Design a protein around this nucleic acid. Structure first.
Ligand code: FME
Ligand code: K
Ligand code: K
Ligand code: MG
Ligand code: MG
Ligand code: MG
Ligand code: MG
Ligand code: MG
Ligand code: MG
Ligand code: MG
Ligand code: MG
Ligand code: MG
Ligand code: MG
Ligand code: MG
Ligand code: MG
Ligand code: MG
Ligand code: MG
Ligand code: MG
Ligand code: MG
Ligand code: MG
Ligand code: MG
Ligand code: MG
Ligand code: MG
Ligand code: MG
Ligand code: MG
Ligand code: MG
Ligand code: MG
Ligand code: MG
Ligand code: MG
Ligand code: MG
Ligand code: MG
Ligand code: MG
Ligand code: MG
Ligand code: MG
Ligand code: MG
Ligand code: MG
Ligand code: MG
Ligand code: MG
Ligand code: MG
Ligand code: MG
Ligand code: MG
Ligand code: MG
Ligand code: MG
Ligand code: MG
Ligand code: MG
Ligand code: MG
Ligand code: MG
Ligand code: MG
Ligand code: MG
Ligand code: MG
Ligand code: MG
Ligand code: MG
Ligand code: MG
Ligand code: MG
Ligand code: MG
Ligand code: MG
Ligand code: MG
Ligand code: MG
Ligand code: MG
Ligand code: MG
Ligand code: MG
Ligand code: MG
Ligand code: MG
Ligand code: MG
Ligand code: MG
Ligand code: MG
Ligand code: MG
Ligand code: MG
Ligand code: MG
Ligand code: MG
Ligand code: MG
Ligand code: MG
Ligand code: MG
Ligand code: MG
Ligand code: MG
Ligand code: MG
Ligand code: MG
Ligand code: MG
Ligand code: MG
Ligand code: MG
Ligand code: MG
Ligand code: MG
Ligand code: MG
Ligand code: MG
Ligand code: MG
Ligand code: MG
Ligand code: MG
Ligand code: MG
Ligand code: MG
Ligand code: MG
Ligand code: MG
Ligand code: MG
Ligand code: MG
Ligand code: MG
Ligand code: MG
Ligand code: MG
Ligand code: MG
Ligand code: MG
Ligand code: MG
Ligand code: MG
Ligand code: MG
Ligand code: MG
Ligand code: MG
Ligand code: MG
Ligand code: MG
Ligand code: MG
Ligand code: MG
Ligand code: MG
Ligand code: MG
Ligand code: MG
Ligand code: MG
Ligand code: MG
Ligand code: MG
Ligand code: MG
Ligand code: MG
Ligand code: MG
Ligand code: MG
Ligand code: MG
Ligand code: MG
Ligand code: MG
Ligand code: MG
Ligand code: MG
Ligand code: MG
Ligand code: MG
Ligand code: MG
Ligand code: MG
Ligand code: MG
Ligand code: MG
Ligand code: MG
Ligand code: MG
Ligand code: MG
Ligand code: MG
Ligand code: MG
Ligand code: MG
Ligand code: MG
Ligand code: MG
Ligand code: MG
Ligand code: MG
Ligand code: MG
Ligand code: MG
Ligand code: MG
Ligand code: MG
Ligand code: MG
Ligand code: MG
Ligand code: MG
Ligand code: MG
Ligand code: MG
Ligand code: MG
Ligand code: MG
Ligand code: MG
Ligand code: MG
Ligand code: MG
Ligand code: MG
Ligand code: MG
Ligand code: MG
Ligand code: MG
Ligand code: MG
Ligand code: MG
Ligand code: MG
Ligand code: MG
Ligand code: MG
Ligand code: MG
Ligand code: MG
Ligand code: MG
Ligand code: MG
Ligand code: MG
Ligand code: MG
Ligand code: MG
Ligand code: MG
Ligand code: MG
Ligand code: MG
Ligand code: MG
Ligand code: MG
Ligand code: MG
Ligand code: MG
Ligand code: MG
Ligand code: MG
Ligand code: MG
Ligand code: MG
Ligand code: MG
Ligand code: MG
Ligand code: MG
Ligand code: MG
Ligand code: MG
Ligand code: MG
Ligand code: MG
Ligand code: MG
Ligand code: MG
Ligand code: MG
Ligand code: MG
Ligand code: MG
Ligand code: MG
Ligand code: MG
Ligand code: MG
Ligand code: MG
Ligand code: MG
Ligand code: MG
Ligand code: MG
Ligand code: MG
Ligand code: MG
Ligand code: MG
Ligand code: MG
Ligand code: MG
Ligand code: MG
Ligand code: MG
Ligand code: MG
Ligand code: MG
Ligand code: MG
Ligand code: MG
Ligand code: MG
Ligand code: MG
Ligand code: MG
Ligand code: MG
Ligand code: MG
Ligand code: MG
Ligand code: MG
Ligand code: MG
Ligand code: MG
Ligand code: MG
Ligand code: MG
Ligand code: MG
Ligand code: MG
Ligand code: MG
Ligand code: MG
Ligand code: MG
Ligand code: MG
Ligand code: MG
Ligand code: MG
Ligand code: MG
Ligand code: MG
Ligand code: MG
Ligand code: MG
Ligand code: MG
Ligand code: MG
Ligand code: MG
Ligand code: MG
Ligand code: MG
Ligand code: MG
Ligand code: MG
Ligand code: MG
Ligand code: MG
Ligand code: MG
Ligand code: MG
Ligand code: MG
Ligand code: MG
Ligand code: MG
Ligand code: MG
Ligand code: MG
Ligand code: MG
Ligand code: MG
Ligand code: MG
Lengths: 114, 208, 122, 119, 55
RNA sequence: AGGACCGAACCGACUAAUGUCGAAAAAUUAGCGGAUGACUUGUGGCUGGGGGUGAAAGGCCAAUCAAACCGGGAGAUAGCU
RNA sequence: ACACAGGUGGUCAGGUAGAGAAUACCAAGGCGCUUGAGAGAACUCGGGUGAAGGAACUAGGCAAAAUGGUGCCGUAACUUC
RNA sequence: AAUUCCUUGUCGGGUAAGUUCCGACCUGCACGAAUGGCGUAAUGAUGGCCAGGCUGUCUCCACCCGAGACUCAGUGAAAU
RNA sequence: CGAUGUCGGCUCAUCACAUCCUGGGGCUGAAGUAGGUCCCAAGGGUAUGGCUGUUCGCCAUUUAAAGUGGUACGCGAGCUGGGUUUAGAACGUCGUGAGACAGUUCGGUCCCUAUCUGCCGUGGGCGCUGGAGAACUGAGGGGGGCUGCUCCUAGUACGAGAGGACCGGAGUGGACGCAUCACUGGUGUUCGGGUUGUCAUGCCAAUGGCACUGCCCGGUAGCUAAAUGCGGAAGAGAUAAGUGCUGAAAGCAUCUAAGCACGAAACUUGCCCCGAGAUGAGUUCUCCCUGACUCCUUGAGAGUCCUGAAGGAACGUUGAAGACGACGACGUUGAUAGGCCGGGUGUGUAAGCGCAGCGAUGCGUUGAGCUAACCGGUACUAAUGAACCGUGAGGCUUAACCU
């Protein structure tokens, strides 16, 4: 409804960069160590993108120290500071959940370069 | 006292601290006081309000008369609230959402979503019997419903299958978040009864 | 979302390779453990040179789960393996000297500050 | 409990239900008027009226779509050539339901459904 | 399953109380032809609201 | 070559659910065993009731078997209901 | 006993895929199973999918899930070889 | 032990915990040599026990798809 | 005995109190912590596994606790059928033998469509005294009632010390319940796509049928938990066991005989839900009907014409309402459905062209095409002018007070 749509549109940040699934993204995140306020980096492959305006989100997969970590980010959260894109993948699917079964050489994806 | 308000879906409010609080958006139109009941006439002090609008033909003459005595436009329905001694209201007064500006917590009341006829599993959290291991025609059934000859009867208030929901229920002490007067809204933290477009009754918390 | 019979890989280098959760501590009928909760462990598979032999009953803390951890923003952090760190029953405190793989923020609560310091991430 | 849901099941499985509308739409386009059951008529609106809009833009992809649905090149020829331009000005509402009592053998509430013209 | 001892005429009647089916008592009349029919239904001749819309 | 192997027809009947005033006085469905042999099946014959037949279970002998079915002795007898 | 989800010997053996008379889709030819129409509660029946977990179920992994083809490589104890 | 009552015999293994299982002991209530004893390969819709895999078996049920159940019209039983 | 299905499990429970925890207390061989015992207290709560048919039991690990009993050793027209108790078979043993064994061993049909009572839901009928539409009061029911740690008080009192509090407050849990879909997910045979076999649309290309949705991959709206908000309370009154005060009988003593106070998760309230069929049928607020005439046993009467209101029901379009009834919206002076339009969301670059390759294929047009249940619009259809029910001023006594 208009009532809700007015409340959402005011909260949404109006400067989100466009990224597709299969893009290597470096999300920056506000972390708090009690009193401190640090910016933590989280580089990884974008696996899934949910678009619902304010309620939009996206999954990033990162094969850190041995085992893999998947992190869903709420796009219009103030905790997400910046979403810098590094590589753009030539993938032809919306959700890249098949990457969870693969590792290493099979898990790598072709670049767009169009 | 209290206000009548349509439920208008849900959203979340992101605070810059780094928290999203899931809010129910309750739109609260001008709640106009149609009648004031007092201890002289009725035997209890109370007010009867209205809200929204209705169609000139769809309102009946008994209601249209009732509304004409106050001077207000005919609102879609009539609700009543008790008065807390100190406060006292006059007829034809339009109560705004600024009443909940100073308060912190509210008891939202509403008619719950009708789940229809419900089985004992869904209604009463009865445990499903073994899905195999020989079970014959009795996976989701209630099992026993009583003892044997001694009562020789099922006791009253036995939890059985039947109507679930479409009943009045009250979520108590939900935290008020934002109280927008311009758009006539009331944002409360958490989920409150009924469906989008259902009538709620919002009123201050009783367990302060 | 760890429960009785759930098998966990081991994050630290205590000696255990795989372990099995035999109880979720801290309440009656308590279904699940996760995030940074204490559980009772039996060791189902250990290495030869390690500090703990097979078939030893001791406590542990779940440091990673497949179901994951919800931050207050609505965001979630999942993993590709349920994982834990072994502790000394009565004394508490980790047995291993180093910790492999990352561990969540929600493990930060005084008694596990030794587990966070050794960890390479978060 | 079917809150906010659409579509009538009509005591059939999907694959059948999808076929019987593919035939009944073909029958409505050909004869321009149909006697059917009041529900089937109400649910036929959702199938047929899109095939009429699809037919307003005569090209190729639309002919092929209108053939992917229906599966009869006669019906696709009656669409586009007649029913496309004949409903050019009119915006939706191409079909009309009129109740025609009850079926003899089973007391089912019958209904005529026809295109809004038949000149 | 199975009755212990047979019910009566009385009970049987009491049960049948609600089986009595209702008449229409709401017959329409077509504007032009003046023929009786069900509301929102066509006539036997083929009229609905004063206009032939059927062969 | 094989009382060999896997596997349809064909012969069977280990498990489960269904069904139990059934679709059916023994079946259906999904699996299951044998499947060139001590196999299976058509057609016709033979063995008869304390008798037959039986890789034996008191199994089978026309939906009936620790003694078939039909008629007869016969209205057996019943200190029992 | 029924217009009965049973039983009943022989013969004929098309196409594409296939080792095949398996299975899938089809040809010739044959039918849609003699109450329908709505609705889309619990509950039952036959199915599909399922987060994290993975036999913790239960008398018992009963039931489901699994595995499944061809070629080549490779294959233990024990053996009556 | 298809045999053991006392008995869940002791001891050992497997398990976090094993009245079952496997190995051993012998105090065989009440084994024992063709009403065969003991061995054992292979075989088994065979009994017991364990593991990997896999799973709605279960934690703990959710949703969906069809056939009934439900309403309407036609026909129309049954046990008691 | 013309049949009262008998162990154990599952499901669902319900009561007792001889209380396991939680709460309140007396004495102690009670310093504190932690107990021992007895008194009061039944509000709520009261493990998961291993073994075994087991109930028990012994273990493993928890827990504030892991209560004891009644209920046909509750519960098979609710499930199971492992046990015991049919027919097969074997071991030991007894018997010359047929066979036999609270000795063991393997295998071994669990039927019932609910008439009544009961119970959970949901309606019709009439009543409540003119009718009708609302809103209520609340007699009387019903849900709810659980606890853990950690911190603070405070290393305080208490103790040589080691240990280590009462009363008080705070945060965050477990279990349980209620709501909900914003997030995280599940589902999503009605949305997109990939793909195998094959048939078909004359053929190519492009599609459609069938193969468990053919097999997969994602996924809208709904529904939903594992998801996320909330709940248990404080307070008040009367109190149990207890603690007292003042105080005779009995110049004292003495909590009791007069009197006066405290005193628990129990009790009545406070919280939530239902609820006027509460026949004791209750209040308000509004709305509507202000006609002639006959007949009789001069009746709370049978009638004739004439009127038909408020409202209702029906019908239709229907819904986050629903088995059917019911309930809510809406019916042209109209957004109630469907269509349509725009947006969204999902899928992931359609077809047709045109290039590149020798072909599969790959580029370009192009984040294209196609998008259910979604959001905001739109009278395009379909929701009818009407008829139908419901009346015509509302009994009889008495009492207050009107001109
Ligand atoms: C045919 S053996 C019957 C055994 C018996 N059954 C029921 O009573 C017992 O008791
Ligand atoms: K004689
Ligand atoms: K293209
Ligand atoms: Mg008055
Ligand atoms: Mg209204
Ligand atoms: Mg509903
Ligand atoms: Mg249900
Ligand atoms: Mg229950
Ligand atoms: Mg269960
Ligand atoms: Mg059975
Ligand atoms: Mg049964
Ligand atoms: Mg059965
Ligand atoms: Mg079921
Ligand atoms: Mg009685
Ligand atoms: Mg061990
Ligand atoms: Mg709808
Ligand atoms: Mg439907
Ligand atoms: Mg049909
Ligand atoms: Mg039907
Ligand atoms: Mg059907
Ligand atoms: Mg199909
Ligand atoms: Mg559409
Ligand atoms: Mg168009
Ligand atoms: Mg009797
Ligand atoms: Mg009569
Ligand atoms: Mg009836
Ligand atoms: Mg008309
Ligand atoms: Mg031979
Ligand atoms: Mg052979
Ligand atoms: Mg072989
Ligand atoms: Mg085989
Ligand atoms: Mg044959
Ligand atoms: Mg058989
Ligand atoms: Mg047979
Ligand atoms: Mg089996
Ligand atoms: Mg089945
Ligand atoms: Mg039956
Ligand atoms: Mg049947
Ligand atoms: Mg079979
Ligand atoms: Mg098999
Ligand atoms: Mg086989
Ligand atoms: Mg064989
Ligand atoms: Mg034969
Ligand atoms: Mg013969
Ligand atoms: Mg002969
Ligand atoms: Mg004889
Ligand atoms: Mg003779
Ligand atoms: Mg003879
Ligand atoms: Mg002889
Ligand atoms: Mg023989
Ligand atoms: Mg015998
Ligand atoms: Mg016979
Ligand atoms: Mg016999
Ligand atoms: Mg004899
Ligand atoms: Mg004889
Ligand atoms: Mg004979
Ligand atoms: Mg004689
Ligand atoms: Mg006689
Ligand atoms: Mg027939
Ligand atoms: Mg036949
Ligand atoms: Mg057959
Ligand atoms: Mg092939
Ligand atoms: Mg075939
Ligand atoms: Mg038939
Ligand atoms: Mg239904
Ligand atoms: Mg169904
Ligand atoms: Mg099934
Ligand atoms: Mg099912
Ligand atoms: Mg499948
Ligand atoms: Mg499955
Ligand atoms: Mg699963
Ligand atoms: Mg999935
Ligand atoms: Mg999974
Ligand atoms: Mg596993
Ligand atoms: Mg077990
Ligand atoms: Mg168990
Ligand atoms: Mg066992
Ligand atoms: Mg067993
Ligand atoms: Mg298994
Ligand atoms: Mg099996
Ligand atoms: Mg299953
Ligand atoms: Mg699977
Ligand atoms: Mg399978
Ligand atoms: Mg698998
Ligand atoms: Mg598979
Ligand atoms: Mg496979
Ligand atoms: Mg292979
Ligand atoms: Mg080996
Ligand atoms: Mg051996
Ligand atoms: Mg023994
Ligand atoms: Mg013994
Ligand atoms: Mg031992
Ligand atoms: Mg051991
Ligand atoms: Mg085991
Ligand atoms: Mg042992
Ligand atoms: Mg056993
Ligand atoms: Mg076992
Ligand atoms: Mg042994
Ligand atoms: Mg001896
Ligand atoms: Mg001897
Ligand atoms: Mg002897
Ligand atoms: Mg012997
Ligand atoms: Mg001997
Ligand atoms: Mg002998
Ligand atoms: Mg001998
Ligand atoms: Mg022998
Ligand atoms: Mg031997
Ligand atoms: Mg041996
Ligand atoms: Mg062997
Ligand atoms: Mg054999
Ligand atoms: Mg065998
Ligand atoms: Mg076996
Ligand atoms: Mg076993
Ligand atoms: Mg296993
Ligand atoms: Mg549930
Ligand atoms: Mg269904
Ligand atoms: Mg009928
Ligand atoms: Mg009869
Ligand atoms: Mg008798
Ligand atoms: Mg009797
Ligand atoms: Mg009985
Ligand atoms: Mg029993
Ligand atoms: Mg059990
Ligand atoms: Mg139980
Ligand atoms: Mg109770
Ligand atoms: Mg009790
Ligand atoms: Mg005592
Ligand atoms: Mg005690
Ligand atoms: Mg205690
Ligand atoms: Mg306490
Ligand atoms: Mg206490
Ligand atoms: Mg206390
Ligand atoms: Mg105490
Ligand atoms: Mg003390
Ligand atoms: Mg005392
Ligand atoms: Mg007591
Ligand atoms: Mg109680
Ligand atoms: Mg009580
Ligand atoms: Mg109380
Ligand atoms: Mg209770
Ligand atoms: Mg207990
Ligand atoms: Mg227990
Ligand atoms: Mg123990
Ligand atoms: Mg007990
Ligand atoms: Mg009994
Ligand atoms: Mg007793
Ligand atoms: Mg019993
Ligand atoms: Mg007892
Ligand atoms: Mg039964
Ligand atoms: Mg029983
Ligand atoms: Mg019973
Ligand atoms: Mg039953
Ligand atoms: Mg049985
Ligand atoms: Mg059995
Ligand atoms: Mg048995
Ligand atoms: Mg037995
Ligand atoms: Mg025997
Ligand atoms: Mg015996
Ligand atoms: Mg015994
Ligand atoms: Mg045994
Ligand atoms: Mg067997
Ligand atoms: Mg059975
Ligand atoms: Mg009844
Ligand atoms: Mg009844
Ligand atoms: Mg009742
Ligand atoms: Mg009455
Ligand atoms: Mg009344
Ligand atoms: Mg009265
Ligand atoms: Mg009361
Ligand atoms: Mg009453
Ligand atoms: Mg109560
Ligand atoms: Mg507490
Ligand atoms: Mg301190
Ligand atoms: Mg301290
Ligand atoms: Mg305290
Ligand atoms: Mg309770
Ligand atoms: Mg909950
Ligand atoms: Mg929503
Ligand atoms: Mg939503
Ligand atoms: Mg979603
Ligand atoms: Mg489709
Ligand atoms: Mg598709
Ligand atoms: Mg082909
Ligand atoms: Mg062709
Ligand atoms: Mg071709
Ligand atoms: Mg082609
Ligand atoms: Mg293509
Ligand atoms: Mg195609
Ligand atoms: Mg076809
Ligand atoms: Mg076919
Ligand atoms: Mg499958
Ligand atoms: Mg499959
Ligand atoms: Mg796949
Ligand atoms: Mg999905
Ligand atoms: Mg999803
Ligand atoms: Mg409170
Ligand atoms: Mg209190
Ligand atoms: Mg007080
Ligand atoms: Mg008091
Ligand atoms: Mg007092
Ligand atoms: Mg005392
Ligand atoms: Mg004195
Ligand atoms: Mg004296
Ligand atoms: Mg004296
Ligand atoms: Mg004194
Ligand atoms: Mg004293
Ligand atoms: Mg409490
Ligand atoms: Mg009420
Ligand atoms: Mg009365
Ligand atoms: Mg009244
Ligand atoms: Mg009055
Ligand atoms: Mg009055
Ligand atoms: Mg007279
Ligand atoms: Mg009129
Ligand atoms: Mg009239
Ligand atoms: Mg009028
Ligand atoms: Mg309806
Ligand atoms: Mg409906
Ligand atoms: Mg009603
Ligand atoms: Mg009504
Ligand atoms: Mg009504
Ligand atoms: Mg209404
Ligand atoms: Mg209305
Ligand atoms: Mg209207
Ligand atoms: Mg018009
Ligand atoms: Mg408008
Ligand atoms: Mg609409
Ligand atoms: Mg629409
Ligand atoms: Mg459209
Ligand atoms: Mg556009
Ligand atoms: Mg657009
Ligand atoms: Mg669109
Ligand atoms: Mg998009
Ligand atoms: Mg392209
Ligand atoms: Mg396509
Ligand atoms: Mg070229
Ligand atoms: Mg591009
Ligand atoms: Mg471009
Ligand atoms: Mg774009
Ligand atoms: Mg575009
Ligand atoms: Mg389009
Ligand atoms: Mg579209
Ligand atoms: Mg709209
Ligand atoms: Mg216009
Ligand atoms: Mg206009
Ligand atoms: Mg027009
Ligand atoms: Mg009208
Ligand atoms: Mg009068
Ligand atoms: Mg008068
Ligand atoms: Mg008056
Ligand atoms: Mg009067």
């Amino acid at each position: 409804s208009n009532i809700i749509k007015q409340l959402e549109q005011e909260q949404m940040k109006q400067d989100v960069p466009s990224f597709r699934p299969g893009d290597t993204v470096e999300v920056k995140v506000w972390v708090v160590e009690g009193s401190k306020k640090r910016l933590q980096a989280f580089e990884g492959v974008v696996i899934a993108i949910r678009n619902r305006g304010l309620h939009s989100a996206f999954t990033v997969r990162k094969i850190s120290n041995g085992e893999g970590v998947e992190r869903v980010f709420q796009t219009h959260s103030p905790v997400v500071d910046s979403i810098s894109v590094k590589r753009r993948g030539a993938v032809r699917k919306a959700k890249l959940y098949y990457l969870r079964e693969r590792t290493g050489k099979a898990a790598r994806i072709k670049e767009r370069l169009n | 006292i209290g206000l009548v308000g349509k439920k208008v879906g849900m959203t979340r409010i992101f605070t810059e601290d780094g928290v999203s609080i899931p809010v129910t958006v309750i739109e609260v139109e001008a709640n106009r006081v149609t009648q004031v009941k007092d201890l002289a006439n009725d035997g209890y002090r109370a007010i009867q309000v209205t809200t929204g609008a209705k169609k000139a033909n769809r309102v009946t003459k008994p209601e249209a008369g009732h509304f004409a005595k106050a001077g207000v436009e005919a609102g879609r329905g009539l609700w009543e609230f008790r008065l807390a001694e100190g406060e006292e209201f006059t007829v034809g007064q339009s109560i705004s959402v600024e009443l909940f500006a100073d308060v912190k917590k509210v008891d939202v009341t509403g008619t719950s979503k009708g789940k229809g006829f419900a089985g004992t599993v869904k209604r009463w959290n009865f445990r499903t019997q073994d899905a195999t291991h020989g079970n014959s025609l009795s996976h989701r059934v209630p099992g026993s419903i009583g003892q044997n000859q001694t009562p020789g009867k099922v006791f009253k208030g036995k939890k059985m299958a039947g109507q679930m929901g479409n009943e009045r229920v009250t979520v108590q002490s939900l935290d008020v978040v934002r109280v927008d007067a311009e758009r006539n809204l009331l944002l409360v933290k958490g989920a409150v009864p009924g469906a989008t477009g259902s009538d709620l009754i919002v009123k201050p918390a009783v367990k302060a | 979302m760890i429960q009785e019979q759930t098998m966990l890989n081991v994050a630290d280098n205590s000696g255990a390779r795989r372990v099995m959760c035999i109880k979720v501590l801290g309440g009656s009928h308590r279904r699940y453990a996760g995030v940074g909760d204490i559980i009772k462990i039996t060791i189902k598979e250990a290495i030869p040179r390690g500090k703990v032999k097979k078939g030893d009953v001791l406590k542990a803390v779940v440091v990673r789960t497949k179901k994951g951890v919800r931050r207050p923003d609505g965001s979630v952090i999942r993993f590709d393996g349920n994982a834990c760190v072994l502790l000394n029953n009565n004394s508490e405190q980790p047995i291993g000297t180093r910790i492999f793989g990352p561990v969540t923020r929600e493990l930060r609560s005084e008694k596990f500050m030794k587990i966070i310091s050794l960890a390479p991430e978060v | 409990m079917r809150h906010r849901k659409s579509g009538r099941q009509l005591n059939r499985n999907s694959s059948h239900r999808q076929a019987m509308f593919r035939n009944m739409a073909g029958s409505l386009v050909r004869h321009e008027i149909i006697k059917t059951t009041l529900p089937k008529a109400k649910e036929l609106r959702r199938v047929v009226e899109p095939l009429i809009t699809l037919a307003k833009t005569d090209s190729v992809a639309n002919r092929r779509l209108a053939f992917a649905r229906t599966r009869d090149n006669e019906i696709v020829a009656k669409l586009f050539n007649e029913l496309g331009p004949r409903f050019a000005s009119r915006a939706g509402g191409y079909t009309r339901i009129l109740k025609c009592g009850f079926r003899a053998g089973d007391n089912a509430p019958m209904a005529y459904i026809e295109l809004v013209d038949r000149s | 399953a199975v009755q212990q001892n047979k019910p009566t005429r009385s009970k049987r009647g009491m049960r049948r109380s609600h089986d009595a089916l209702t008449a229409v008592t709401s017959l329409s009349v077509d504007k032009t032809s003046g023929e009786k029919h069900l509301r929102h239904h066509i006539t036997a001749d083929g009229y609905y609201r004063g206009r032939k819309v059927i062969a």
